[PDB]
Each structure stands twice: as C-alpha cells, then as structure tokens.
C-alpha cells in the first residue's frame, strides 16, 4: 500500500547486471548440440577479442574462487 | 535411482516499511537518489533578533542577527546477502524435463526469497539508523527539565 | 487510546537533480535545494519579498 | 568558520527559532555559527 | 602594401551576468561564461560528441 | 609545387571500407549503441 526505500525492480536489474556469465557447456553427445556450442565459442572469442565496445564490456564483465592445491 | 528430495521452506518475515511505523512522524523523508555522490550537506538559518526599546539609558543592541549552519550526518547501511552459484547456474538455462522444472522453480523461489530479505534488511536497518540518530541527538529528561 | 490510526504520506518526497542543478553539479559541484525558488526570488521577482 | 555570509533567497518560516537563542549560542550549542551585530548585519556584496 | 585596411569588429563583444548565471553568482560566487551552452551540452542531448 | 599538394590515387578504393569500419566502430556513435544493446540484454536477463 505504501512505498519502500528500495524498489525491487532496480535491485533486480542491478543483480542481473552484476551477474557472472554462465560457464560454457560443450555437448559431446550430438553434433547438432555440438555445432551450437562451437558457434557460441567462436562468437565469444570474436566479441571478446575484436576492437570494439564488446571487448571492454566482456572484460569488465569478468569477475577475477580459485581452487587450492591438494596433497 | 536418484530421488529428488523436497524440504519445506518458510519465510518468517514481518513486512515493515519506514512509512508504516509511527517513527516517520519525526522525519520529513526525501529520496535524494544520488546520495553516494554527496560529499556534504548544508542548511543555513538566519535568525534576526528583535530587541526592546528601553526608557533607561542602556547599551542598545543594534539589530543582532545570527547565521547558524547545520551539517548533515551521512552514514551508509550495508547488508551482505549471499547467493549460491549452484542454484544460480540453473537460472540461465530453460527447463525441458520435470526434474529441471522442479529445481529451476526452487532456484527461482530461493533467489526471490533471499532477494526480498535484503530489501527487508535494508528497511530494518533504515529504521534502526533513524532511531539511533534520534537517540544520539537526545539529551536526558533531567537536563531538559531545567534547560528548556 | 483517543485514536486508532493517523494519516500520512504514502511515499517519500521526490528530490532529484534538474538540468540547472546538474550543470551546477558538473562544473562547480554544488547543488541547491530548489533552483526554481532561487530563480523566482532573485531573477524573477527580487523586490517581491517573501 | 564554514558559515557563508553570502546573500540568499532566505525562505521565511514562522517557527519560533529564537526561543532562548543567545544564551544557547553563546554557550556553543551549534557547531559553527556567526553573530553579526550592527553594521555587519547586512547582505554581503556579490 | 597588398591592402590598406582590414575588416574587423565594430564593438566589444559584451557579456553580462544573465539570469541563470546570477543564481550561481549570488549563492556560490562562481559564474561561468556561456551557461546556456553548458545547458546545451550536458542537459539537451548529452550523448552528442563535440 | 607541380601539383598543389594533391594526389588522386585509385589505391584508396578498397581500403575505404576495411579501414573505415574499424575507426567508425569506436567513433562514439557505435560505442554508445553497443553499450545500449548490452544494457538491453541486461534488462532482458531477469524478466525470464
């Protein structure tokens, strides 16, 4: 009925903005499920290495959770 | 056979807003949406003091006027809401099997519950910091019994 | 109790920075409260006292 | 002192601000104030 | 001499403290020149490169 | 000067596009466009 100090939509889109990208799956089961993953891989390298706004966007998007050594 | 296991979740929460309490009677609330950028606040009062013309010859106070200022108190509140990546990596994909549809809506309910608890934590922190601001500028009763 | 409820504001007052405030915020870094009232009491009707 | 003596569109309110003020300000309730008595009680030049 | 006279201006390009500038003149003691151009830069479509 | 500092080469006929779409890709008319498109992807993210 009244207004909170925080809108849920702004916090929701801020969390969606600061979210880490998903880890890249690679289906070795079906070739139809394999070609989409390799197309995603080459598009990821293209938009992460070409000199445009996409490279700096993906570079800021990356977070660095390193695993420790074990004996 | 891998059995899915369901556990009952509860949300023991009381939805309280800062306009729901009577504490907001003490506070004229504005929403300056950029308060991280403010270095300092300022508000000036210019009280002109009238006097009394007197019959006896006394040293007359020629139009006294005070100019006082009041600096703002700026303090931030920080909650630290955790969110596991296990029920976050399934938030990006789409379900196609009912086990994925179960764990996806479980992840959705988890992040929606923990998200709206951070908002409630900030509201309770807001009411806490308003109440402690009112406590910090509060003389006790036995002082204002005579100073007022 | 003499009463059971009190009326009051349902939402917080909205004070966002306007274009004139933003220019004064960009260059000098100093924002006033009500730029329209400062303009109304200096450069629109200065002799009209408050 | 951080008080600015500049001229201003001084908004006039009706609350009794000067309820036991001089004995309060001489004792220093305010963090930073300025008393202007006589010829300094004017608006400053721009 | 390849010419005997030059075409120059005829009066001083004046600039007085206008209305919008006067608020920052009185309240801050900081006047900019061409305030309207600053308004045109950072309010009226600030996405345009100069 | 045998010509008034003008040369008119037909070499610059195919590199008028290949060298152009790199300097115009960072010409602030596409950086804002690409970042607004990524902002639109960000707004498309939580609504699902």
UniProtKB/Swiss-Prot annotation, chain A:
It is found in: Virion; Host nucleus. This is Triplex capsid protein 1. The chain holds residues 2 to 91 of 364 of the full protein. Interacts with TRX2, MCP and capsid vertex component 2/CVC2. The gene is TRX1. Belongs to the herpesviridae TRX1 protein family. It comes from Epstein-Barr virus (strain B95-8) (HHV-4). Structural component of the T=16 icosahedral capsid. The capsid is composed of pentamers and hexamers of major capsid protein/MCP, which are linked together by heterotrimers called triplexes. These triplexes are formed by a single molecule of triplex protein 1/TRX1 and two copies of triplex protein 2/TRX2. Additionally, TRX1 is required for efficient transport of TRX2 to the nucleus, which is the site of capsid assembly.
From Swiss-Prot, chain B:
Transmembrane segments: none annotated. It is found in: Virion; Host nucleus. Homomultimer. Makes the hexons and eleven out of twelve pentons. Interacts with triplex proteins 1/TRX1 and 2/TRX2; adjacent capsomers are linked together in groups of three by triplexes, heterotrimeric complexes composed of one molecule of TRX1 and two molecules of TRX2. Interacts with scaffold protein; this interaction allows efficient MCP transport to the host nucleus. Interacts with capsid vertex component 2/CVC2. Interacts with the small capsomere-interacting protein/SCP. Self-assembles to form an icosahedral capsid with a T=16 symmetry, about 200 nm in diameter, and consisting of 150 hexons and 12 pentons (total of 162 capsomers). Hexons form the edges and faces of the capsid and are each composed of six MCP molecules. In contrast, one penton is found at each of the 12 vertices. Eleven of the pentons are MCP pentamers, while the last vertex is occupied by the portal complex. Belongs to the herpesviridae major capsid protein family. This is Major capsid protein. The lineage of its organism: Viruses, Duplodnaviria, Heunggongvirae, Peploviricota, Herviviricetes. The chain holds residues 51 to 198 of 1381 of the full protein.
UniProtKB/Swiss-Prot annotation, chain D:
It is found in: Virion; Host nucleus. Homomultimer. Makes the hexons and eleven out of twelve pentons. Interacts with triplex proteins 1/TRX1 and 2/TRX2; adjacent capsomers are linked together in groups of three by triplexes, heterotrimeric complexes composed of one molecule of TRX1 and two molecules of TRX2. Interacts with scaffold protein; this interaction allows efficient MCP transport to the host nucleus. Interacts with capsid vertex component 2/CVC2. Interacts with the small capsomere-interacting protein/SCP. Belongs to the herpesviridae major capsid protein family. Self-assembles to form an icosahedral capsid with a T=16 symmetry, about 200 nm in diameter, and consisting of 150 hexons and 12 pentons (total of 162 capsomers). Hexons form the edges and faces of the capsid and are each composed of six MCP molecules. In contrast, one penton is found at each of the 12 vertices. Eleven of the pentons are MCP pentamers, while the last vertex is occupied by the portal complex. This is Major capsid protein. The lineage of its organism: Viruses, Duplodnaviria, Heunggongvirae, Peploviricota, Herviviricetes. The chain holds residues 5 to 50 of 1381 of the full protein.
